[PDB]
Amino acid sequence: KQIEDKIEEILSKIYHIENEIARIKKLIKVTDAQVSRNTQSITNLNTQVSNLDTRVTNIENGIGDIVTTGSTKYFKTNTDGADANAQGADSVAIGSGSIAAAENSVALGTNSVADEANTVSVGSSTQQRRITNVAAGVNNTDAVNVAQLKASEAGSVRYETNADGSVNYSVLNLGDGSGGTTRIGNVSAAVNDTDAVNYAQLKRSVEEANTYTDQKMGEMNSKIKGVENKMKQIEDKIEEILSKIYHIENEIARIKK
Amino acid sequence: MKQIEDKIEEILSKIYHIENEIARIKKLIKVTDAQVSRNTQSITNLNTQVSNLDTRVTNIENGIGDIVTTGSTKYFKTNTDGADANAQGADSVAIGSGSIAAAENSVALGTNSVADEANTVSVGSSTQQRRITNVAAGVNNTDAVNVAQLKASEAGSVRYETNADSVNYSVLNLGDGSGGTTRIGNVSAAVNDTDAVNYAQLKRSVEEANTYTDQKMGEMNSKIKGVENKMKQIEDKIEEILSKIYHIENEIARIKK
Amino acid sequence: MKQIEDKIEEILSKIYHIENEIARIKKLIKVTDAQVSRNTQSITNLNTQVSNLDTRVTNIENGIGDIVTTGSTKYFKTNTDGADANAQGADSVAIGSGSIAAAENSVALGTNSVADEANTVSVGSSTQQRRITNVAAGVNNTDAVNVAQLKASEAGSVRYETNADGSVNYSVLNLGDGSGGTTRIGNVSAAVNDTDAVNYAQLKRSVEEANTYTDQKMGEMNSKIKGVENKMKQIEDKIEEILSKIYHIENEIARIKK
Ligand SMILES: [Cl-]
């Protein structure tokens, strides 16, 4: 009676334990299914993160490098200086220490300063720059080069300049510099006392002097002609006197007899 | 009691199988924990990696800010809202908003600058030009020329004055600009009417006038000599007439007696 | 019944140990489940983080576009496939493929431009130069000069002619306006030397000298004519006297006739 019932009790306890263990196995399976999802998720994330690392490293190597250097492959500077400063509206500043303070200006070169509107500065009042390899200008608003200035000034007539920089204006020596002379052509007639005289004008002045001589001359030729005419009158009077005397001498000789 | 011993055997059999399942379950739990331990570590690694990517990405975001939006690096800067630069020509360079380097191997420098001819650098356009400032005097033949250099080519030279119309070619004023005059040396003798004459020619021309005067004096001297020739003849005839009369007067007086 | 009661006690003890094992197992499973929840959550968070990073990186890549590959920003641009610019000199600047700023504080501007002297801006090289265009006329002494300015300056210039070989022809200086007009030369001093230009005052004095010579000479001629006129008047008086004598002789002879 007591034992048979206790055996049944144990048998039911075993039954319930078997069910509990099966329930526990099921829980382990449910957990494992989540761990499987997590393991897979981790795998997906490892891939995505190494893919982003690569993309970030490429961004770093490229555009990162232009930030720190301030240069691209085609716009380069070699400098430790302070940033360029495009201060003015629509200004452009190129090079460390450069400052384009004025509207629509360009400061070009390290430490260049553009402080007037609509200009391109290639330096400053303390450091200027020559501009080199400039081809001869053609259009009116092209820059001119030294060779063009030299060609344009060749043949220019100049005074001598003294050592102190003053010009000696009191003499203008023409000619080749070794004894040669220069003919000055296309000269107008002098009007003021200190104007140069031209050749037509010289010739005209000789002709005036000769005309004055003729005017004086012909006054004396009138006197000389008056003397010439009077002289013929005297000659006729003499011939008449000689004739008279001949007749007197003949008359006296006939009185003699 | 046969049923009781049968049930005891059944109980023991069930217990053996339960004990076996418990051992299997304990192994299963360990398999799961080992994977969970791996996943936990994988997650900690991913947290660290993602945190690092975040910092590398934030640093890049800080660096590229002004470069993408303002188109400017620390040494290449512009202050503008306008249209992109446009390097259209092969090997061209365009710097500044609205700039257009249209032609081959050209450079458009500055906001709205336009380069429309091959192998040129434009500092502006036909709608807006720019002076170039802080240019040091050119030395090489292909260096640019500054205003100082042009002014120095003018200084000390002989130049026509301008009107304001522009150059007045009708007068060339020499001298020092304050009353002083200029002696012009090495001047060749004038050939054409409009050539400047030299002092040698002036002197010769005075000599010609005086020679002309001397010639006319000579003509008058000969007319006079001719008059004095007839005059001496007259003088001799008179002396002879006077003599005749003396002899007549004496002859008449002797007749009187 | 005592052999059986013993086996029953033994069985109850086995069940006790099994119960204790099962309770230990449920505790372990609770512990694992808690860690799995933390992991699941951490993964969800990571998924969002990583997706946000993806978007930020993509937006970076799109912001840049081709700034790296073409070396150009929206405002500093070149169209070229050549070698990198090279700013070699201290404080130098190089702009354009193949450009080389070799010298200190220099600027090489444009494709293949070379700056090889200090403190210069080169717009080309010894083998390829460039004109500089749309330059407004210089005002300041250190402003660049344009072609219009050079031409205006040259137009006011007095110049000898240049031969084809570049020598200057000093033998002729042609003034005038180019067509056929002439130039009056002002502020000229009196000539001293035979090859000096003469001025108008000097011409006028020369005319005076000549006129004076004429007056002196004609005065001397006038004196000579006067001298002849006087001697002619002497002859006239002698004749009048001779005529008078003859009148008296003729009257005297007539009185002798009676
Ligand atoms: Cl997990």
CA angle B188-B161-B144, nearest 5°?
Answer: 95
Residue C194 identity (one-letter amino acid) = D
Nearest CA in chain B to C45: B47
Q: Please give the helix or strand (H or E) that residue C223 lies within, else none.
A: helix C200-256
CA of A48 to the centre of ligand 1 (A): 19
Tell me, what DSSP letter sits at residue A185? E
Interface size, chain B vs chain C, as Cβ–Cβ contacts under 8 Å: 385
What is d(CA A182, CA A173) in angstroms, rounded to the nearest whole number? 9
| Chain C residues close to B123, C-beta within 8 Å | 132-135
Distance CA B237, CA A237 (A): 11
Sign of the CA dihedral running A73, A74, A79, A82? negative
> Rounded distance, CA B222 to CA B219, Å?
5
Burial group, residue C222, by CB count within 10 angstroms (0-12, 13-18, 19+): middle
The resolution in angstroms reads 2.0
Give φ, ψ of B135 to 5 degrees.
Answer: -85, 120
Residues B39 and C106: their CA atoms lie apart, in Å, by 60
Contact between A245 and B249 (Cβ < 8 Å)? no
Which class is C1-77 in CATH? mainly alpha
Which amino acid type is present at position C100? I
Radius of gyration of chain B (CA): 65
Cα–Cα dist A123/C121, whole Å: 10
- Tokens encoding B97: 């908003």
Domain B189-257 top-level CATH class = mainly alpha
For residue A92, which of C251, C35, C95, C208 has the smallest C-alpha distance? C95
Separation between Cα atoms, residue C210 and residue A14, nearest integer Å: 168
Most C CBs within 10 A among B26, B32, B39, B91, hence the mutation to make, goes to B91
Candidates B177, A101, B15; CA nearest to C18 is B15
Query: Which 8-state DSSP code applies to residue A64?
Result: I
Residues in a beta bridge with A75? C95
Three-state secondary-structure class, residue A88: coil
Three-state secondary structure call for residue C1: coil
Enumerate residues 6+ apart whose C-beta is below 8 A from B122: B101, B106, B107, B108, B109, B113, B114, B115, B116, C132, C133, C134
The angle that helices A2-59 and B2-69 make with each other, rounded to 10 degrees, is 20
Sequence ranges of the domains in chain B: 1-77, 78-131, 132-188, 189-257
> Which among B135, C134, B121 has a CA at the least distance from the CA of A146?
B135
**How many residues does the structure list for chain C?**
258
Distance of CA B9 to the CA centre of its chain: 119
We find that the CATH architecture of domain C78-131 is Sandwich (2.60)
Q: How far apart are CA A163 and CA A161, in angstroms?
A: 7
CA A127/CA B131 separation, integer angstroms: 18
- Domain C132-189, CATH 6.10.250.2040 — does that match? yes
Q: What would the two tokens of residue C14 be? A: 């086995």
User: CA-to-CA distance for A129 and A149, rounded, in angstroms?
Assistant: 19
Q: Rounded to whole angstroms, how far apart are CA atoms C6 and A152?
A: 137
Whether B119 contacts B135, CB under 8 Å: no
What single string gives the DSSP state of each residue in chain B? -HHHHHHHHHHHHHHHHHHHHHHHHHHHHHHHHHHHHHHHHHHHHHHHHHHHHHHHHHHHHHHHHHHHHS---SSEEE---SPPPEE-STTEEEESTT-EE-STT-EEESTT-EE-STTEEESS-SS--BEEESBPPP-STTSB-BHHHHHHHHTTB-BPEE----EETTEEE-S-SSS--BEEESBPPP-STTSBPBHHHHHHHHHHHHHHHHHHHHHHHHHHHHHHHHHHHHHHHHHHHHHHHHHHHHHHHHH--
Q: Domain A1-76's class? A: mainly alpha
Enter the tokens of residue C128. Answer: 């390829």
Determine the Cα–Cα distance for residues A30 and C150; give it in Å rounded to an integer.
95
The two domains B1-77 and B189-257 share their CATH topology (first three levels equal): yes
Nearest partner of C131 among A137, B113, B91, B131, judged by Cα: A137
Pairwise CA distance, residues A75 & A88, whole Å: 21
The backbone torsions φ and ψ at residue C82, rounded to the nearest 5 degrees and listed phi first, read -85, -170
Distances (CA, A) of B178 to A169, A170, B182, C200: 11, 12, 12, 20
Report yes or no: B39 and A39 within 8 Å, Cβ to Cβ: yes
Q: How far apart are CA B125 and CA B100, in angstroms?
A: 10
String of DSSP letters for C168-183: EETTEEE-S-SSS--B
Q: Dihedral, CA atoms, A37, A39, A44, A46, nearest 10 degrees?
A: 160
- Nearest 5°: phi and psi at A77? -140, 155
Q: Got the DSSP string for C94-139?
A: EESTT-EE-STT-EEESTT-EE-STTEEESS-SS--BEEESBPPP-
The method of structure determination was: X-ray
Burial class (CB in 10 A: 0-12, 13-18, 19+), B244: middle
CA gap A212, A216 in Å, rounded: 6
Angle, CA B18 vertex, CA B15 and CA B19 arms, to 5°: 85
Residues 6+ apart with CB under 8 A from A221: B220, B223
Q: How many helices (H) and strands (E) does chain C have?
A: 4, 12
- Per-residue DSSP letter, A108: E
| Strand bridging mode B167-168 / B161-162 | antiparallel
Interchain contact, A90 vs B82, CB within 8 Å: yes
CA distance A171 to C138: 33
What part of B 39-98 touches C (C-beta under 8 Å)?
Answer: 39-40, 43, 46-47, 50, 53-54, 57, 60-61, 64, 67-68, 71-73, 75-76, 78, 80, 84-97
- Give CA–CA dist B181/A195, Å, rounded: 10
Contact by Cβ (8 Å): C124, A135: yes
Write out the two tokens for A60. Answer: 């770093």
Fold of domain A131-188: 6.10.250
- Give the up-direction half-sphere exposure of residue C174: CA atoms within 13 A in the CB hemisphere: 9
The answer to whether B122 and B136 are in contact (CB under 8 A) is no
Long-range pairs of C226-234 with CB within 8 A, sequence gap ≥ 24: C228/A227, C228/B224, C228/B227, C228/B228, C228/B231, C229/A223, C229/A227, C231/B231, C232/A227, C232/A230, C232/A231, C232/A234, C232/B231
CB-based contact A206:C206 (threshold 8 Å): no
End-to-end CA distance of chain A: 259
Strand partners, A46: none
DSSP state for residue A124 in the 8-state scheme: -
Neighbours of chain A (3+ CB pairs under 8 A): B, C
Q: Tell me which residue has tokens 């107008």.
A: A188
C158 token code pair = 């007095």
C123, C148, C158: residue with CB nearest A140: C148
Residue type, A256: K
Contact assignment for B77 to A94 by CB distance below 8 Å:
yes
Annotate A58-86 with b (16+ C-beta within 10 A) or e (fewer). Answer: ebbeebbebbeebbbbbbbbbbebeebbb
* Helix pair B147-154, C147-155: axis angle to 10 deg: 10
Write down the architecture of domain A77-130 according to CATH.
Sandwich (2.60)
Q: CA B114, CA B107: separation in Å to the nearest integer?
A: 8
d(CA B111, CA B123): 9
Pick the CATH number of B132-188 from 6.10.250.2040, 2.40.50.140, 2.60.120.200, 1.10.10.10: 6.10.250.2040
Q: Which fold has domain C190-258?
A: 1.20.5
Q: CB B73 to CB C72 under 8 A?
A: no
Report how far residue C193's alpha carbon sits from residue B184's, in angstroms, rounded to the nearest whole number: 10
Interface test with A, best of C38, C147, C153, C243 (most A CBs within 10 A): C147
DSSP state of C143: S
User: Do residues A197 and B190 make contact, with C-beta atoms less than 8 angstroms apart?
Assistant: no
Tell me the C-alpha distance between A101 and A117, whole Å: 8
Tokens for C202, please give them: 């000097």
